[PDB]
Amino acid sequence: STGSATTTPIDSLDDAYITPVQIGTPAQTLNLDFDTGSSDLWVFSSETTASEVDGQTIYTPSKSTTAKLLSGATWSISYGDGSSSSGDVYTDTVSVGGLTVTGQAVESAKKVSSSFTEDSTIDGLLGLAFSTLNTVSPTQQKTFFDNAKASLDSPVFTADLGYHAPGTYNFGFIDTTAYTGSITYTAVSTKQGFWEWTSTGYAVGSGTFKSTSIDGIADTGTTLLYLPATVVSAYWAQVSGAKSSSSVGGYVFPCSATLPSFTFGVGSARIVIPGDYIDFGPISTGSSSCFGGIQSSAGIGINIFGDVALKAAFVVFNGATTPTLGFASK
Numbered sequence: 255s256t257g258s259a260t261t262t263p264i265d266s267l268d269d270a271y272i273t274p275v276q277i278g279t280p281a282q283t284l285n286l287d288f289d290t291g292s293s294d295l296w297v298f299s300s301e302t303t304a305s306e307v308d309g310q311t312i313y314t315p316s317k318s319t320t321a322k323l324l325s326g327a328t329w330s331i332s333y334g335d336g337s338s339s340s341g342d343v344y345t346d347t348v349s350v351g352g353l354t355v356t357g358q359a360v361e362s363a364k365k366v367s368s369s370f371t372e373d374s375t376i377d378g379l380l381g382l383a384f385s386t387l388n389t390v391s392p393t394q395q396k397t398f399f400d401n402a403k404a405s406l407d408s409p410v411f412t413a414d415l416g417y418h419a420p421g422t423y424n425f426g427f428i429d430t431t432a433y434t435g436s437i438t439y440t441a442v443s444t445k446q447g448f449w450e451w452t453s454t455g456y457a458v459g460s461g462t463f464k465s466t467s468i469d470g471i472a473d474t475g476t477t478l479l480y481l482p483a484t485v486v487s488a489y490w491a492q493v494s495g496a497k498s499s500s501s502v503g504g505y506v507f508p509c510s511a512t513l514p515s516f517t518f519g520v521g522s523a524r525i526v527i528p529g530d531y532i533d534f535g536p537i538s539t540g541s542s543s544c545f546g547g548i549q550s551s552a553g554i555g556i557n558i559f560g561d562v563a564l565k566a567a568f569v570v571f572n573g574a575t576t577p578t579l580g581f582a583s584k
């Protein structure tokens with residue numbers, strides 16, 4: 255089997271991407287944030303505290319003839335941005351882009367933190383990291399990908415995120431029309447439950463490539479590119495008037511600037527992030543200070559290849575017995 259779904263930016267900055275997902279019988283379609291940095295499929299629901307719902311579409315398990323309570327199961331997750339959610343668990347039929355899993359754990363939110371309530375466009379998350387990170391207790395549950403994998407034509411999914419435009423998540427096949435050149439594959443460590451890999455270095459603009467190992471995660475659920483402070487300083491030193499602002503919480507730059515590109519290494523290959531991808535617009539409405547899309551990972555404990563990096567590539571998440579990542583230009 256295969257599936258193919260369009261993923262759409264939630265706003266003019268590409269702060270996140272939403273993908274329609276069918277849950278239950280008859281289908282209830284929710285727009286989920288596909289997150290390769292976590293492993294829970296959770297939704298706003300008929301159980302969510304009413305004051306914490308503000309415009310989201312909800313899953314109502316009582317209206318699904320295939321929903322079953324997973325008795326005794328609870329979940330509770332905290333994300334790297336400080337957000338959180340928790341609740342109870344149903345199993346139900348979940349379809350993405352024509353690919354159907356029966357008996358998928360659908361984690362129903364009873365509580366969500368304020369940043370979820372405030373994002374009216376995100377109805378929940380669909381985690382695509384390794385199932386070892388799933389938070390369901392006392393019986394850990396599998397991701398949608400792990401449940402689909404044996405049925406898929408090939409045990410892979412691909413992320414093709416757009417810059418200020420829709421893109422695609424495919425399951426079970428490589429679309430050889432969706433990228434240029436060849437796909438470079440690189441090793442993955444699953445020891446922390448992430449799609450963790452080692453970039454071979456970077457360049458700033460038209461500068462020379464610096465060969466250096468950068469361990470980090472491929473994370474579609476993180477907006478920005480978080481790298482070591484040395485690398486990030488080297489980037490923003492090429493932008494007149496850029497500075498790290500403790501009050502704003504990262505590097506800012508004059509909105510009048512034209513930004514240089516950023517290149518990262520994948521083995522001997524190179525992915526170029528155009529400068530405009532690194533502009534996240536005014537820090538507050540009408541400001542002439544703009545927020546940078548490359549930020550320091552120093553306060554995080556891991557480097558994060560988030561959407562700023564991934565949207566410059568066609569990315570293969572290869573779930574073969576020994577997982578690997580693939581990157582192609584596009």
Ligand SMILES: CC(C)(CN)Oc1cc(F)cc(F)c1
Pocket residue numbers: 270287288289291333334335337338369370373376379474475476
């Ligand atoms: C949608 C927001 C950004 C709201 N707090 O929640 C996350 C957090 C994550 F770390 C990952 C993700 F995909 C969504």
